[PDB]
Amino acid sequence: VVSTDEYVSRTSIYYYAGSSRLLAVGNPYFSIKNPTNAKKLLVPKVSGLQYRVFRVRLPDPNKFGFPDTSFYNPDTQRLVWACVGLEIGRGQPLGVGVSGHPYLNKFDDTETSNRYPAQPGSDNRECLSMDYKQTQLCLIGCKPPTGEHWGKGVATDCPPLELFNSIIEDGDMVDTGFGCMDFGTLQANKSDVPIDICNSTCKYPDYLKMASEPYGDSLFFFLRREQMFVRHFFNRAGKLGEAVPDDLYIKGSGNTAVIQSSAFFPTPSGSIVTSESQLFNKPYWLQRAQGHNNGICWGNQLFVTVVDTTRSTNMTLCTEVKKESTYKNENFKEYVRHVEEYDLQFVFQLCKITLTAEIMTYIHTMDSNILEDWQFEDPLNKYTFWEVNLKEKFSADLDQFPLGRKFLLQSGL
Amino acid sequence: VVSTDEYVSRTSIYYYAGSSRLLAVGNPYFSIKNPTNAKKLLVPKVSGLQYRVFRVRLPDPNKFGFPDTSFYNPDTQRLVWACVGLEIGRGQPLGVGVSGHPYLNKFDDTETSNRYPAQPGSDNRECLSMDYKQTQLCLIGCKPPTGEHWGKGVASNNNAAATDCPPLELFNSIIEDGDMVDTGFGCMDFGTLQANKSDVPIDICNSTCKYPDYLKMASEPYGDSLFFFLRREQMFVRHFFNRAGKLGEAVPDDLYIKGSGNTAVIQSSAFFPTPSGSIVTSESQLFNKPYWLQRAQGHNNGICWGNQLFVTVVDTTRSTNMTLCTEVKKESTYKNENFKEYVRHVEEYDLQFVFQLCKITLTAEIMTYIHTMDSNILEDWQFEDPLNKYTFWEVNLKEKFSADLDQFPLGRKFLLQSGL
Amino acid sequence: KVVSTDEYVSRTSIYYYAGSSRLLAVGNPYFSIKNPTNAKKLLVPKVSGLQYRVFRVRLPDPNKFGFPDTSFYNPDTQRLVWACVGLEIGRGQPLGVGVSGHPYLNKFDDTETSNRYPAQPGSDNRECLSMDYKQTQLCLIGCKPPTGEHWGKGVASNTDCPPLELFNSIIEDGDMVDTGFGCMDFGTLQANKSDVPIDICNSTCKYPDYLKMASEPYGDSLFFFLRREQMFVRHFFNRAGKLGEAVPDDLYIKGSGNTAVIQSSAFFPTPSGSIVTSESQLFNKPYWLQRAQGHNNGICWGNQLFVTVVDTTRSTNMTLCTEVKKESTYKNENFKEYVRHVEEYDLQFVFQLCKITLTAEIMTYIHTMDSNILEDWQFEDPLNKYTFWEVNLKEKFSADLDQFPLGRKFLLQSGL
Amino acid sequence: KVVSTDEYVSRTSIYYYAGSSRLLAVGNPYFSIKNPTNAKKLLVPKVSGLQYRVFRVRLPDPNKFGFPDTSFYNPDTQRLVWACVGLEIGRGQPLGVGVSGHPYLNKFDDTETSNRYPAQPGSDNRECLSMDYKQTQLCLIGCKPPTGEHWGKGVASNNTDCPPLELFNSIIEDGDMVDTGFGCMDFGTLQANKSDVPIDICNSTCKYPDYLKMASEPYGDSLFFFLRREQMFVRHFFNRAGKLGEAVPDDLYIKGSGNTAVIQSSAFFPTPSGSIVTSESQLFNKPYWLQRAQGHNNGICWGNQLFVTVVDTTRSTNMTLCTEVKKESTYKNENFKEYVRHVEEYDLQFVFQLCKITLTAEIMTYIHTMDSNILEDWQFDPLNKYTFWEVNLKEKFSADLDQFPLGRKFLLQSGL
C-alpha cells in the first residue's frame, strides 16, 4: 500500500461547497410515534449526546459540467475530489442538559452515611437526574466511522461480554460516563441508567482499528476532547450477583449480619463548558493525513462525524390548558425539546489519475467498485446517515464564501 | 560506568512491531474462582487501578531472518534491538470508576458536626464508596520496574510499654502485572497492616499498593529500568471521617484541657480522609501519542538487552466500571428480587513499536564491560530465568516484526519525524 | 562595601558530586511519644507533612581534601572553598493529602448558611472535627540557616487582648509551617488549646522571613528559593467562650426577645489545600545555581550549606490497625487504631571547587564578613543549640559525575 | 496641548535606591476600638486585608539634596526632579484567607434548593453568619493620590421610595474599604438597617478605583503603572427580611392562593467567595520597571512625593487569640476570652533616576499651566485633609544600588 501522493495528480482547480443551515428538533430522551403507524416517527429523538454522522454527497467530477475539460484526457484519466479544507459550523448557545430516570435504580447514597441495617424493599427506585460526561469530537474520511461497544457475548451467572465493532450511524448514542455498551441487552431492568440510553447502544470510536486500516479511508483527520468526574456515589438495589469473598472482610452480627450491596455506581458530571475549549467553528486544513489516503474522496462521497455535548441545553416548554386567576399545577403541561444547528463548509481540490496498468491493478485491489463507477446495491444504504447533498452546491468562486476566504489566505493564492 | 552509545553501533535498518488489540475483561473488585477447586479463575482481577506490566518479547536478531546479512560479521559481532519509537494505544472511553466496602470502618463525619458524646458500638461499619486518586504513568526499560511499599517490620525491642503500633519497613519489590497502584491511602500492605480488613475498600483491603521507586530506579548504575517515563498524579480530600475502635496512641494531656460530663469521654482522633481524583480530561492524556526515545537520561540509551522490553502502564482515566443486570423472572411489575446486579471493567491496549537494528563488535574492552554488566548477555550470545517467578502480561512480537514502516501508523510517524 | 563573590573567589574547572542517598523519617503526624524511662529520649518522633525539613549539609574541608593533583593552587597564599552549582531535592512516596483535627475543637455553630437565634450556649460545646491544611511547597538553600517569622505575646503595657510582637528566629528541623491559621505561637496566644488542631495547638508555626533574608548585605541565607502556596476557605465556624471585643452599637440595631442575646462574632475559617498535582511539583528536578540575587553566589562558607524544605503534597497519613482478639464476628473492642506518617528524601548536589588568593585587601574583607573563615583556615559552634537534620557528605564526594544522575544532568547543561 | 515628559525632562545617569524597610500594621479586622469616652482616640486601629494601603512616599528635594558631585547641572536655568524607574512591593506574612460576618446578618431563607411556602413568621429573624470576601490584588503608583468611585445617596426626588443613586468620585485614602462582592457603595447611608452586609463594611464606604477617569486625565499623573487581579464566585443564595419595596409586577407570575397567597421576598442577595489564593497568581514581591508609561507622565515625581496604593486580600488571615481568665483542670467556656487580630507586612523598595529640566520660557509656561505649585516650590497642601500611610525616604536615599536587592535587579536589568 502506497500513498495517494504517488498516483493521484493534484490540479490547481479548487471548489467550495457548503451545506447551509442544518437543523434537528426533537425530544432529547425518546421519540414520539405517529398515532397512525407505530413504526413511523412523528417527533424524532434529538440529543446533544447523539452522534451526527454526515454522509456528504459530491458531484461526480467525471460527469461534472466543467467549462474547460482540456486539463485531463478522459481516454486515459479519471477525476476524483480531494478534501483540503473543512469547517464545522455550530449554532445555538453553549450549555448543558440533564438526563434522568423516573425509576432510577438507586438505593442508598454511599458517599458519607449509609449505616446498617439495610432498607431493602421490593421497589426502591427513585426519580433522579444527572449531567452526562462531556465529549467533543470530529472525524473525517471517505468511509463511515467504526465504533466499538460491549454487548452480550457467547456462553457465575454474569452475562458474557463481547466487544463488537459496528458502523456509527447518525443518531447513535455516545458514551455518557457509564461506558460504551448495549444497555438494552446488558441491563435487563431498564432502570440502571437514564431513559435516553437505557434501551440504546452507546458507541465509542474505535480509533485504534480505524488508524491501523491499510488504506486509511476512515480517518483523514480527527479532534477529540472528553472530560468527566464523579459527582455522586450510589449503590444498586437487587440481588448482588457476585458476593464479596470472605477473605475481604470480617463478618458482622446483629444489625450488621445482613451485608449491604457492594454494587456501587457513580453519577458522572461533564463539569463546565467554555468557549476557549471549542473544537468547532474553526477551519481544519487537511494538508497531510497520517494515513495513506491524503483526503481523497473515492466514490465522490465524504463522511463527517460530530459529537458536541457543549450545547446540550434542554429547553422547557409549557402550555396553558385552562386559564385561571390562581396557579394550579393541573392547568399546565410540561414538555422538553432539544435542538441542534450545523453549518458544514468544505473546500475541495480537483485531482486526476492516469489509469496505467500498474495503477488500475492497485485501484482494483483497493476497491474494485472505484474502476466500475469510472466506466474504465450500495452496501452502505442499509445504515442510517444524515446525508448532505452538495451535488448542486459546488462553486468555483471561493472568495464569495467564508471558508474559501480563509483558504486563499492560508495557501497564499 | 559509561554510555551505550560508543559501543553500540547504530545501523539504518528499522523494523516495526505491533501487539494488535489487547483486551482484559473482569471484575474491578475481586477475582472469582472457577470453581473446581481454587487457583482456577472464572473471573480474573481487572481494575483501572492496576499496573499493566507488559513483558514484550522480541525476536533474537542474531537468529532473525534478515534478507541480507552482509551488514555485520557473526564471527566477532552480535545484534540487538534498540527502541526508538513507541505509542501506547488506549481503547475505551475516558471515565472514572468507584470502589467501596460494604463494611467500611467509618464512624462519624468529622467535617462540620460531630458533637459530644460519641455513640460507640461493637459494630458501626458502613457501606460507603469513593473515587480513587487519579494516576497516569508509563515506564519503559529492558528490566521490570521496582516499586516501593510499607509493610510490617521486625518485632524489635520494648515489647511492653512503648507503643504497639506495628513496625514499619520500606520494602522494594518488582512491580507485577495486576498489582494495585496507590489510591490515596498510601503505598502499604493493607492485608498485613490493617488487620480488620475494613479500613479501605475491598479492592485493596487484602492487597499491596505499590508506588514506583523512582529515586532507586534512576540511581541504578546502568539505567536499565527507565529508558523513559511519564507520570501524572492528582487528588484532593473529599470527606473527613474517623475510625471506630480503641485508639492505640492517646492524645497527650499537654495538647488539650480535659472535658466533663457528656464531654468527659474523648472521641477518637484516628482520622482518615477519602480521596478524589477530580476530573479526567483529554488534554491531560499521556497515551495515544508517540514517544521518540532519542536520548535517555541513563547510560542505557534504549538498548533492549536480552531481546525483551518492559512497558509498565497505570491509567485510571478509563476506570469506568460497567453495571450488568440480568432478569431472573419476567413479571409485569418491577421487583428487586427478580434481578441480579454485576459490575465489570475492561481495558484495551494496542502497543506499537519502532526498533533500530544495532551491532556490537566484541573487543576485549567491550567484552569486559558486558560481562561485568550482565554475564548472561554474552552467554545468551554464546560468545533458569529468575524473572519467571513473577507475573507479567507477555506480548510476543517474535512473529510480528515488519520492515515496511510506511504500512503501519507509528512507522509513518517515525519516518516523517526523523526525515527519512 | 559588600562586593560579589565573583570579584574575589576564583572559579576552577574542578567539579565534585555528592549525594545523601535515602533519607527517611517515620513517626506520628500529630505528636511525639516520650519514653517513660527517659524523658529526654524518644519512642515515636513527630513526623508530619506540615513540618520544615532543615538539612545541615556537612562538606569535607577542601583545604584538607585528597585531590589527586594539588598543583592548581598554592596553600602558601590561597585557601579553598566549595561552591554549589546544582541541586535536586529527591522526594519519594506518592502524592497525597493528610488531615489534622482535634477531639475537643472549639467550634460552636456552623455560620455558613443556617445559624438562627436564639443561641444555645453551654459550658462545653467542643467537637471532634478535622480538616485539610493549607498546601505549601518551598525550598531554601544557603550557607546559613533560614530566618523565620511568627507572632507571639508582646510586652504588657497599660481590652484584655494579648499584645502581639513579630519575632524572628532560626527555623529548626521539625518546626511547623503555617497551616492556614497564621504564623503564631499558638501555645501562648491561644490559652484554651482548642482553637486549632492538636498538631499545632501547642506549637509555633513559622513563615519564612523572605524580606529579611533577601535584604541582608552578604546574602548567605538565600542563594536560591522556590515557593508555591495555595488554600481556600472550606467551612465557616465561630468560637465558643466569652467574646473579648464586643461589636460597637453603631454597627447593628439591637435585637429583642429571642434575638436579645447577641451571638459570638468570633468567626474562624477552616483551610483547604485543594488538589495536589504532578505538574505543580517543585522537587525531583534540578536547580542550576548560576547567578544568585545576593552577593554570595553559592559559596559554601565553613564547608556547610543549609537546605530548608516544606512539602505538604505528600502529607498522606497511613492508617494502621492491630487485632487484639481474633473472633468470627466484628467487634470494635478487639482492635487498636494508629496513625503514622513517613517522609522520604534524596538530596543530590553538584559542587565547584574554588580558590581565594588572600591578599591584604581580601583578608580584611573576609575578616569583617566573618572572622571565623580566616581562623578555621589557620591563615563552641553557636549553631549547635539548634536542631537540624544532619547530612554528612564528607565521605560522599566523587569527581566522576558520569554514573551519578544529577552529574549527567549538569554535564548536559554546562556542555562539558 | 499635553506633551510627554520625554520631550522636556532631561534624563541623567544618576540612580538612587530608597527603601521603607519593614512596615507593619496590627489591629482588629472588623472595627477599630476607640476610648470608652473619647471620640478620636484609637486603642486598636482597624487593620484589614480588605483595606486600601495608600502610601504617600516622601522623597528628598533634589534641589536641596547633598549630592557628592553637583557639577551635572546648572541651577541658573535648571531644576531637578526624581523619576521612578523601579519598584518592588515586598509582602510579608503567609498567603491565606480571612472571613467576615455579622452576628445579626439580615438573612431570612436559603434560596438555593428548598424555600417552600409559607414564609416564616418573626419580627426579627437575623442570623449569625460569616463568609470569605471576593479576592482582590491591585497596585497603583503615581505622583497624585488615586481616584476611587462609589455609589451614594443622590439628590432628592421631585415628588417607589427607593433612595436615589449617584456615582461619586473621591480620593482613595489609606484604610478605605475595597469592594468585597457587595459593590462599591456607601453602606452606611444606603443600608439603614446596618444588617445587610458584614460589620466591617456595613458602616463603611467601599471604593473601586476609577480606572477610566484616571486613564483619561490629561497629564497622566495618577497611573504611572498599575496591576490588578480580581476573582469571585457565588457561594450561597439568600434573601432579605423586611418589606419588599418594589413588588413584582403581575405580568411576571400567576398569583398564589391558600398556602401560597402571601408572596415571599424576591430581594435576593448572594454571598461571595474569592476561591483559592495561589503563589503563581501573586502580583507582589517582584520588581516593576517603569520604562514607558501609557500616560504622558513617564514616572516624574512632581512635588518630590509618590503614591503607592495596594490591595492584597491574599494575606487576609485573621489570627485567633485566646486568654485564660481562670486556670482550672476542666474546660469551661466562661473561663476564656476570644479575640481576633489581623496584621499586614510591607516593604516598599524603589529605584529613582535623577532628572533635570531646562526652564525655558516655553517650558515655564507649560509647567505653569500644568501645576503652578511646581515653579513656586522651585523658587524659579490640599492633600493634608486626607489620611495616608506616610513613608519618609528623605534619609533613605542611597547611591549604592548593588548593596540592595532591588538595586541589584536594576543593574542586572539595565546592563549597568
Numbering used by the authors:
A (entry chain B): 21 to 175, 183 to 403, 437 to 473
B (entry chain A): 21 to 403, 437 to 473
C (entry chain C): 20 to 177, 183 to 403, 437 to 473
D (entry chain D): 20 to 178, 183 to 403, 438 to 473
Question: What sentences appear in the manuscript?
Answer:
HPVs are non-enveloped, double-stranded DNA viruses comprising multiple copies of the major (L1) and minor (L2) capsid proteins. High-level neutralizing antibodies elicited by L1 VLPs can block HPV infection; however, protection against HPV infection is type-restricted, and there tends to be little cross-reactivity among HPV types. Each L1 monomer folds into a canonical, eight-stranded β-barrel (BIDG-CHEF), with the strands joined via flexible surface loops (BC, DE, EF, FG, HI).
We solved the crystal structures of pentamers of the lead double and triple chimeric candidates H58-33BC and H58-33BC-52HI to resolutions of 2.5Å and 3.5Å, respectively. By loop swapping with a few aa mutations on HPV58 L1—i.e., S80N, N82T, N84A and V87L for BC loop, T375K, G378S and D383E for HI loop —the resurfaced structural contours of the BC and HI loops of the chimera nearly recapitulate those of the HPV33 BC loop (middle and right) and HPV52 HI loop (right), respectively. H58-33BC-52DE and H58-33BC-52HI also showed high titers (2,280–23,440 and 2,180–87,430, respectively; P < 0.001) as compared with the H58-33BC control. Monkeys (n = 4 per group) were administered with 5 μg of the H58-33BC-52HI chimeric VLPs formulated with aluminum adjuvant at week 0 and 8. Nevertheless, the cross-reactive antibody titers for HPV33 were significantly (26-fold) higher with the chimeric VLPs (960 to 6,290, P < 0.001) than with the HPV58 WT VLPs; reciprocally, the anti-HPV58 antibody titer (6,060 to 40,960) of H58-33BC-52HI was also 54-fold higher than that of HPV33 WT VLPs (P < 0.001). The chimeric VLPs could also elicit a mean neutralization titer of 5,400 (1,780 to 8,460) against HPV52 (middle). Based on our immunogenicity assays in mice and non-human privates, we have successfully generated triple-type chimeric HPV proteins that can simultaneously present three independent immunodominant epitopes, using seven or fewer amino acid substitutions.
